[PDB]
Design an enzyme around this catalytic site. Structure first.
Site, mmCIF file in Angstrom:
data_model
loop_
_atom_site.group_PDB
_atom_site.id
_atom_site.type_symbol
_atom_site.label_atom_id
_atom_site.label_comp_id
_atom_site.label_asym_id
_atom_site.label_seq_id
_atom_site.Cartn_x
_atom_site.Cartn_y
_atom_site.Cartn_z
ATOM 1 N N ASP A 35 13.870 -31.805 -21.044
ATOM 2 C CA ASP A 35 12.792 -32.663 -21.212
ATOM 3 C C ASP A 35 12.961 -33.718 -22.510
ATOM 4 O OD1 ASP A 35 11.049 -31.870 -19.013
ATOM 5 O OD2 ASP A 35 9.985 -30.480 -20.078
ATOM 6 N N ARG A 43 -4.107 -19.779 -13.531
ATOM 7 C CA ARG A 43 -4.728 -19.830 -14.904
ATOM 8 C C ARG A 43 -6.254 -19.431 -14.279
ATOM 9 N NH1 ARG A 43 -4.512 -25.960 -16.470
ATOM 10 N NH2 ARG A 43 -2.378 -25.282 -17.486
ATOM 11 N N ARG A 53 20.499 -32.130 -7.186
ATOM 12 C CA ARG A 53 19.665 -32.753 -6.275
ATOM 13 C C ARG A 53 19.568 -34.198 -6.409
ATOM 14 N NH1 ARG A 53 16.950 -30.927 -1.543
ATOM 15 N NH2 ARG A 53 19.379 -30.798 -1.470
#
Ligand SMILES: Cc1cc2nc3c(=O)[nH]c(=O)nc-3n(C[C@H](O)[C@H](O)[C@H](O)COP(=O)(O)OP(=O)(O)OC[C@H]3O[C@@H](n4cnc5c(N)ncnc54)[C@H](O)[C@@H]3O)c2cc1C
Length: 377
Positions: free
Chosen positions: A345, A172, A244
């Site tokens: 999320d 960015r 994981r």
């Protein structure tokens, strides 16, 4: 008035449950854990007064205004913009890679346009096959910020994953160090657990904790919403799905251990992946003592909490076996990060849970069968 079993008191179960409860259905929510919340659960450390995010840092962020409006109904949302540092090469950097990271990395003073020229002349490569092969950014940066982080986080070499997963130049070209580009970003003043408790706070919802789902029960209800592991529902009859797991090693420091919420350790020479100092997620609170977690990434063996799903050919092939067992089921919907084997999320969870309930509700006003999946896998 339908009788619903929900398996899970996380966002999925809480949000499906409350939508249904409000249209007069009788929702029974069970959870094997001794507490509601799922992986979003936080609790106040008893010695320190610190709100600990128990299953790792949880930062709320969304571009969905309906999801934002919904969480504000259930919590006081506090402005909080997450900023990550990374330690590597005996130096401390801003993450994601930005103008400061570059200028500090290469001991330079580049303006944005000069930095774009650097990254182009630092990139390397005809048609890229590996994630390793993305010389978007070149060798020193791939190795500093990407190589050791993938090895620790995924237990894989970046030459082993495909060129996808890195679609764009990861830099960015300014001094903005907000980690997340989402429009709405906050933190529940009193935690996610109080938020989800509010969500569950309806007379048509009964919550039972320390209770495992048992299959035979399914016959006492008009429908089941199941946010537990999709392979576990089938007893892992085809084998375990790739995940994981994370170990969090808790310690209390008197004072400020690291001065930020999250510090990543990019190197393989550091065995933990990052350190979280939880008091930093509540900047409106003052705490003398501080609870921190060193975080360790590792293969999800048996009896581990599944955290991050590995989702390559081998796993999706194994998923497909469960998927066609499941698409044969009659009065059940699998939902959420575990019921569907995706990383979701919190905001995307609630979104999908509002929609799931909306689909189910429609299915009744109409004539129509409720699907086993509300989103595609
Ligand atoms: C390490 C990590 C960090 C994260 N940080 C963020 C973040 O910063 N920002 C963000 O937006 N999202 C974050 N998330 C995502 C967030 O954790 C998920 O969106 C959220 O957990 C989804 O909740 P859920 O209701 O769908 O499922 P879960 O939270 O996993 O809840 C499922 C519940 O089902 C229960 N259960 C399972 N099987 C059974 C059974 N057989 N019987 C009874 N109970 C059962 C479990 O006990 C659990 O409580 C993070 C995820 C991980 C893994």
């Amino acid at each position: 008035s339908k009788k619903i079993l929900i398996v899970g008191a996380g966002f999925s179960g809480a949000v499906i449950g409350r939508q249904l409860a409000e249209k007069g259905h009788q929702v029974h929510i069970i959870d094997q854990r001794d507490h509601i919340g799922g992986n979003s659960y936080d609790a106040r450390d008893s010695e320190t007064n610190v709100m600990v995010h128990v299953y790792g840092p949880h930062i709320f962020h969304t571009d969905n205004e309906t999801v934002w409006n919904y969480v504000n109904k259930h919590a006081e949302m506090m402005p909080y913009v997450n900023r990550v540092k990374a330690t590597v090469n005996g130096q401390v950097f801003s993450l994601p890679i930005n103008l400061h990271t570059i200028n500090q990395f290469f001991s330079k003073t580049c303006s944005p346009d000069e930095a774009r020229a650097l990254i182009a002349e630092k990139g390397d490569d005809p048609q890229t096959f590996e994630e390793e092969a993305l010389r978007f950014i070149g060798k020193e940066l791939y190795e500093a910020f990407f190589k050791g982080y993938t090895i620790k986080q995924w237990g894989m070499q970046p030459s082993e994953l495909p060129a996808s997963i890195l679609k764009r130049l990861p830099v960015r070209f300014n001094y903005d160090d907000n980690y997340f580009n989402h429009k709405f970003q906050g933190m529940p003043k009193c935690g996610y657990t109080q938020m989800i408790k509010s969500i569950l706070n309806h007379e048509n919802i009964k919550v039972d904790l320390q209770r495992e789902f048992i299959v035979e029960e399914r016959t006492h209800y008009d429908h089941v919403f199941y946010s537990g592991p999709l392979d576990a529902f089938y007893g892992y009859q085809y084998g375990r799905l790739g995940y994981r797991t994370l170990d969090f090693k808790k310690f209390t420091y008197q004072g400020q251990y690291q001065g930020c919420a999250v510090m990543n350790y990019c190197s393989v020479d550091v065995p933990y992946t990052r350190i979280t100092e939880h008091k930093y997620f509540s900047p409106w609170e003052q705490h003398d003592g501080s609870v921190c977690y060193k975080e360790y990434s590792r293969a999800c063996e048996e009896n581990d909490i599944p955290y991050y799903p590995i989702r390559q050919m081998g796993e999706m092939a194994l998923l497909e076996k469960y998927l066609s067992l499941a698409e044969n089921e009659t009065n059940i919907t699998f939902v959420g990060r575990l019921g569907t084997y995706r990383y979701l999320d919190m905001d995307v969870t609630i979104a999908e849970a509002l929609k799931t309930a909306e689909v189910y509700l429609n299915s009744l006003t109409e004539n129509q069968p409720m699907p086993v999946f509300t989103v595609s896998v």
